Amino acid sequence: ITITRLLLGLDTTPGSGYLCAMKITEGDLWIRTYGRLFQKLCSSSAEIPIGIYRTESH
Amino acid sequence: VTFSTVGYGDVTPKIWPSQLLVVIMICVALVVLPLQFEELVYLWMERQKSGGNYSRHRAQTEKHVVLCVSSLKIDLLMDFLNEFYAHPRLQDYYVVILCPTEMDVQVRRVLQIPLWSQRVIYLQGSALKDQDLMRAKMDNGEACFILSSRNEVDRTAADHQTILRAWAVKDFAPNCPLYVQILKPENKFHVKFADHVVCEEECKYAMLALNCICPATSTLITLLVHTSRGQEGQESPEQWQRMYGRCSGNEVYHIRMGDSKFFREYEGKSFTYAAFHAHKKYGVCLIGLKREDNKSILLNPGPRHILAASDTCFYINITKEENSAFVEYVKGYPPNSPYIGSSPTLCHLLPVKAPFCCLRLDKGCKHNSYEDAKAYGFKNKLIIVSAETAGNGLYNFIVPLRAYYRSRKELNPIVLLLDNKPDHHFLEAICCFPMVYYMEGSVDNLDSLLQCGIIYADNLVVVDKESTMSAEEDYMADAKTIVNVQTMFRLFPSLSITTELTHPSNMRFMQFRAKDSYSLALSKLEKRERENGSNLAFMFRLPFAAGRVFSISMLDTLLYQSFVKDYMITITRLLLGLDTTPGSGYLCAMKITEGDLWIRTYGRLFQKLCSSSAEIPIGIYRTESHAAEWISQQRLSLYRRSERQELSELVKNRMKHLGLPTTGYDHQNTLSYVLINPPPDTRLEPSDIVYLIRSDPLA
Amino acid sequence: RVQVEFYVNENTFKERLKLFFIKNQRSSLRIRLFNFSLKLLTCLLYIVRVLLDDPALGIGCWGCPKQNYSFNDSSSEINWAPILWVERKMTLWAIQVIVAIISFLETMLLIYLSYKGNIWEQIFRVSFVLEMINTLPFIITIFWPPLRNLFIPVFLNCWLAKHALENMINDFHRSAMFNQVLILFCTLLCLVFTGTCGIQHLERAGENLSLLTSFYFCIVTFSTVGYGDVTPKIWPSQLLVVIMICVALVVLPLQFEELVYLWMERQKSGGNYSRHRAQTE
Amino acid sequence: VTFSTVGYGDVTPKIWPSQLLVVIMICVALVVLPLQFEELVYLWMERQKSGGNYSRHRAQTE
Amino acid sequence: GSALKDQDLMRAKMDNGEACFILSSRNEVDRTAADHQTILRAWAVKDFAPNCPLYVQILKP
Ligand SMILES: [K+]
Ligand SMILES: [K+]
Ligand SMILES: [K+]
Ligand SMILES: [K+]
Ligand code: NA
Ligand SMILES: [Zn+2]
């Protein structure tokens, strides 16, 4: 309950992060793998990616 | 053995005509019997209801008593049998019950047990049909109890059900004492022919209006009208639960003075002399007497009164004596009485009737432009009543607060938080009383109470809403009022909130300190009384004993007790000031301060009063001790603030928004209970409030 | 002075034991446990009594005059001696008569104790008369020697044993539908019990039916089977099965009606978590 | 002819164990059958509604 | 049986449970009265089984 209410910003403990989103553009397409994306973020902005919102052509 | 389908075969037909006969005799059986069975099962379902009849032979000897209710419930019945049969004089009587509806499932077994099977008789049938008044033998009963239904959707139509039922039983059994419990005070004059009438609204509102002056008065009048032996909670480890459960066995009893062993010797002496020396010697409190010449009963007639051989004495004792081994405010009557039969009382009145615009608070008028109790600047602490619809019953809340014997400077500004705008009929009644205001709102929202002046209010009487009484489930009646009060108990810990509950069983939800586990202990105290069958199973609840919660199911016992004691309704209605016989005293209160601490014992307090002011103390209300770098610390501080700080920051911010000054806003670790007529050796601890019956000022 | 309350009522001898017998809830079940177990005790001693006797060696009134009795089908007359005379014992007489006097004094004490209404209600009730007819003949038998070995339908005490049991379960449990089917089992036990004992004793004149044979016969009769291998041959036993059938259709449907009134209640409120389960589960 | 409560009597138990067995068999019948009957009548009322089904074999041809 | 009656909290052995789940009724006509059913049920189970972890699902904030 605390983890969920922290992701939605319902409660704000000082020093705790917030759930954000980033759009992978063609300028970031050289980062082929999700792991390499983890490496870039955890060395520049220290943002921890939870998951991926993937869109297809159905 | 043939029609039982057994057919042993020792005896059988051997010749063809008899063989045909048993065949044709069998066949007629399956064609004649099922038809009888069908109508029988069509009447099997009818036998479930309409069950019972009181035989005419029984009525000549059994000396029964009828109880015409519209719908019998388990709570209402067990409050009657535990009271009707608590007197030794009534052990012979049979209880007949004329309920038009069938027996409730939980009422089945409690009438099936051997104790309540040879006493209680249930007859489904309406008192409005003379065919059902013959079954109950209404012409032979020793008393008839009509009780109004409290939990119906219509309250003025559940009262006309009672007026017609009092009329139907009066012309069918003219020589039968009638006992009526009416709901509203406007319908009180139609049942005036009855011997003993108890009105819920007139009596309830006048006791919620005495908790503001004499705390826990609604509890004192509750344990007085509940007949109990006086042994509840004697096995308790706690000291107060032993003594408070003992003194709560005190009832108001009557006796002729010459036949009384208590008061015989004080013939020809002053009444205050007899009252004190009876308490000193035996421990009985003589509250008032009735002379033989008059039929009026006077509470504490005064020191000038002299006892006589003919007078009748009303005292408080554990049991009956025969069961004992050894600007200026003008003083005048309010002109416009909202209903017929309204008791005229000498009250404090404004010299000129205030206009209806001057009574309202939230919006000012041409005369005064004040909008809240802060702008008015009341000298005394307020009294807020959170009723729903102001009516005849609420008018009975103001008269005891404005009566003449109350000190003029001690008058508390009454403010009514009405959910609905009062009618012009009600405003005409209260326009004469001083410092009586009203304002639309509710107890739920916080702005309305702040505008009312709840910051500096001594009491917040939360009257039960008439809309919620018809709730199906028991808790659903007070599910909103308990939570709304629980919000104000946190926001305003110092406030004294008196709540009216629809069902007395909802007292458990009231106090609800979360960390405390004393609620479990309070149930163990009730289990032993449940097995012992005591009237006051609710006696040891913390809100009830402190006088904070009062349901009108507590005063239904006033009517049944009036059967054996015809004076109980007059005595009760005299203590609340509902009726004012000239020369009768009034219920007062005194606070024992440290300046009076040299009076160690309650008996010595009796001696001081009965020699200086001739005030007779009933009991004791005893209390116990039971920029990004700058707001980075704002985040750390506003996140770690306690709930008490969060709530305090809420009311102050609202007062800032509505415009009231933030100052003056700035907690109940206290246990209270009511000792009725304690022995004269009991100590007088500080913070004690002693109930009094002061003599009539105009004696 | 010192004053003690309510001494007017409790000091009286009648009112003190009024609380003990009727008013006190805890004492009532203790008293009923005494009566119900006593009624089972007198019924069991009845079953013992019929068990150890063999009427082949001689039946008489009491003492010396005992002679073997025989039955023949051709003579349509009944020898009425074995129907009334039975050489019950000396000790079963003693233990049973103690029960008989104890029940009489206990109930007549209750008769006066609960009397309020011209003692019309108490005498008429079926519970009162049933105890009279199976104890009063058994109290007067103390006086005479020749009336000691006299047949008394003491098996009928199972009915008052059932009445004591249902007065028990009304207040305390020692479910709701189980509380009624248990009573339905009891009345079936009492109904069979009187049928077995009644047929056994009435068949002392003829067929000399044993106790088990009568029990089998009584079961195939109340189940409406009626094979016919064992049948009553003499008119008192024929009357008994007729009157035993008739009481069945007038005592059983009443139990059935309240059971079906509780059959519908068994659909809801079902389930309970046993206290033994909570300690481990 | 015993569980139908007929009991002609041409064939009967003559010895006490068999006599006990028919007695105990009648007793278990009266305690095991009403329980089955109760749930059946609780489902007798449900048979009035929700009645009917179109067989899969019928759909291929009908 | 209702959790508001201690006679039914003894059957469920509320004093012995390892957790108590009160869930509000979402599909009732009154949403502020289906919430007070839960506040009182959280109160009733708290004073009958004070040493029992309580789990409440409330409807309105
Ligand atoms: K049959
Ligand atoms: K047959
Ligand atoms: K048959
Ligand atoms: K049959
Ligand atoms: Na009392
Ligand atoms: Zn004005």
Curated annotation (Swiss-Prot), chain D:
Tell me the compartments it is located in: Cell membrane
Q: Which post-translational modifications are recorded for this protein? A: Phosphorylated by protein kinase C. Phosphorylation of the C-terminal domain increases channel activity.
Its transmembrane ranges are: 15-48
Q: In which tissues is it expressed?
A: Highest expression in liver, brain and spinal cord. Lowest expression in skeletal muscle.
Where does this protein hold K(+) 1? 6-7
Give disulfide pairs as residue numbers: none
Coiled coil ranges? none
The record places the following residue ranges in the Extracellular compartment, namely 13-14
| Subunit and partners | Homotetramer; which constitutes the Na(+)-activated K(+) channel. Interacts with KCNT2; these heterodimer channels differ from the homomers in their unitary conductance, kinetic behavior, subcellular localization, and response to activation of protein kinase C. Interacts (via C-terminus) with FMR1; this interaction alters gating properties of KCNT1. Interacts with CRBN via its cytoplasmic C-terminus.
Q: What is known of its domains?
A: The cytoplasmic gating ring domain of the closed KCNT1 channel harbors multiple K(+) and Zn(2+) sites, which stabilize the channel in the closed conformation. Under low-Na(+) conditions, the abundant cytoplasmic K(+) ions stabilize the gating ring domain in a closed conformation. KCNT1 contains at least two Na(+)-sensitive sites in the RCKs domain where Na(+) binding induces expansion and rotation of the gating ring that opens the inner gate.
Family membership, please give it.
Belongs to the potassium channel family. Calcium-activated (TC 1.A.1.3) subfamily. KCa4.1/KCNT1 sub-subfamily.
Q: Which disease is it linked to?
A: Developmental and epileptic encephalopathy 14: A rare epileptic encephalopathy of infancy that combines pharmacoresistant seizures with developmental delay. This severe neurologic disorder is characterized by onset in the first 6 months of life of refractory focal seizures and arrest of psychomotor development. Ictal EEG shows discharges that arise randomly from various areas of both hemispheres and migrate from one brain region to another.
Q: What does this protein do?
A: Sodium-activated K(+) channel. Acts as an important mediator of neuronal membrane excitability. Contributes to the delayed outward currents. Regulates neuronal bursting in sensory neurons. Contributes to synaptic development and plasticity.
- Name it: Potassium channel subfamily T member 1
Q: List the gene name.
A: KCNT1
First-to-last residue of the parent protein present: 291 to 352 of 1230
